[PDB]
Amino acid sequence: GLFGAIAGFIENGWEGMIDGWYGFRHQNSEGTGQAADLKSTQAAMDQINGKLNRVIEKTNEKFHQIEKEFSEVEGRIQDLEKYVEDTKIDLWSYNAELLVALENQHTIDLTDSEMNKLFEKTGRQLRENAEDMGNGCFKIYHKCDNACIESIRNGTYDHDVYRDEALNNRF
């Protein structure tokens, strides 16, 4: 994708994450763990539902039309009737092909974008108390118990609290 997170600097996805689309894996003092990020999962799903509902908008209801199958050869009028229908079908077939291609490229790019957005939001939360390893992971330069991890995940991490400790571990 355009943002280079999914199938980019994040080497691969997590089959083990089944309660969300994006999220967090940590290793700290107290062991390892995993949590879904709800907000970014919701943003992606909401955008995808939005486009799904636009595509499946019932928009044509047709009643009496032209004949499209013929049991007798007739010539000129029938040639035109067939050509009109074959023209129509080709144009709609093209619309359908283009639509999915554009939609799918865009879906891949917005999902890549939501990953990247979560990664930057997190980096900005951690200020100078952490460093981007370049593979989707932050090395945090202070003691971060399970309470501290949940604080990063649930949006309440005050960086000033750990800053002096972390600045010294870095430099």
Binding site: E11, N12, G23, V55, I56, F63, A101, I108, A130, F138
Partner: protein
């Protein structure tokens, strides 16, 4: 003594391939199908009024072929003509059959109003063994085969004004005998003529005497014609022989009505979209079942499958 916080995204063991602008195949976590490619095989009887023609074409029901009498005064949203349908009355042709079939199908009704035409000095209600009605000879219910009275067929000159506020459809015909013997025996005069006119149009038909291929015993034929009479206008029928007279008019409507050729059986279920293969669901925007449709239908396309990605790119491990 630090900690590591990794950001990531889900994956699944078995993703689906989709197309994009840049790749004809690329794997995503999930997708949904946009082309309806299957049908029940059955035409749902709601919410549209389906009228199964069974053994009858719309035109045979219009004219009133005896095995089609059950369709008298019927209405429909969709009339369904079956490949087993047959004619069993006087052999006939309709110049511009396709148009008559279309306009009737579209009107959505066979509602017929008998009018008191006065046919002075001819015999009414002619019948043929090719068109049995009960045990004896008969004819199309909505047409009146006129023949000589005693030894004369006078000039017929009749009028029927339209003093209603709706259009009237009149169906009428001309008889084409096989021999001169038959012509003069039925109509006295050696050459018939049928002239049907309004203020705004006229059609004059000269019958054609000669053999055609034998159909249900007969080398003669009837040709069917139609005339619409608008409010304030007037029908005039003028003939010195060979007239197959109307008995009245059909009431015309406009609306959602149509006709479809299909052998799919009718079932008790609910479907907005009908094809000749049967009803199809209309939740998807496209369909590959049949280009012939009626109702709220997906648009017909040539592709049998198109997948809309409903998730991110799948990168397993």
């Amino acid at each position: 003594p630090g900690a590591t916080l990794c950001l990531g995204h889900h994956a699944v063991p078995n993703g689906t391939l989709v197309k994009t602008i840049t790749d004809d195949q690329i794997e995503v976590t999930n997708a949904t199908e946009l082309v309806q490619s299957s049908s029940t095989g059955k035409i749902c009887n709601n919410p549209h009024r389906i009228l199964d023609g069974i053994d009858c074409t719309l035109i045979d029901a219009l004219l009133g072929d005896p095995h089609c009498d059950v369709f008298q005064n019927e209405t429909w949203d969709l009339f369904v003509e079956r490949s087993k349908a047959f004619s069993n009355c006087y052999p006939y042709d309709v110049p511009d059959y396709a148009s008559l079939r279309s306009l009737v199908a579209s009107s959505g009704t066979l509602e017929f109003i008998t009018e008191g035409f006065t046919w002075t000095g001819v015999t009414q209600n002619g019948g043929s063994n090719a068109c049995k009605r009960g045990p004896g000879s008969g004819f199309f219910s909505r047409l009146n085969w006129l023949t000589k009275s005693g030894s004369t067929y006078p000039v017929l000159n009749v009028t029927m004004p339209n003093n209603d506020n709706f259009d009237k459809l009149y169906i009428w015909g001309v008889h084409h005998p096989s021999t001169n013997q038959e012509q003069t025996s039925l109509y006295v005069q050696a050459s018939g003529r049928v002239t049907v006119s309004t203020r705004r149009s006229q059609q004059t038909i000269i019958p054609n005497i000669g053999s055609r291929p034998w159909v249900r015993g007969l080398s003669s034929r009837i040709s069917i014609y139609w005339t619409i009479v608008k409010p304030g206008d007037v029908l005039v029928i003028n003939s010195n022989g060979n007239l197959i007279a109307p008995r009245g008019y059909f009431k015309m409507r406009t609306g959602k009505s149509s006709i479809m050729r299909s052998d799919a059986p009718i079932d008790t279920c609910i479907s907005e979209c009908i094809t000749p293969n049967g009803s199809i669901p209309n939740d998807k925007p496209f369909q590959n079942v049949n280009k012939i449709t009626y109702g709220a239908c997906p648009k017909y396309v040539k592709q049998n499958t198109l997948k809309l990605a409903t998730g991110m790119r799948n990168v397993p491990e």
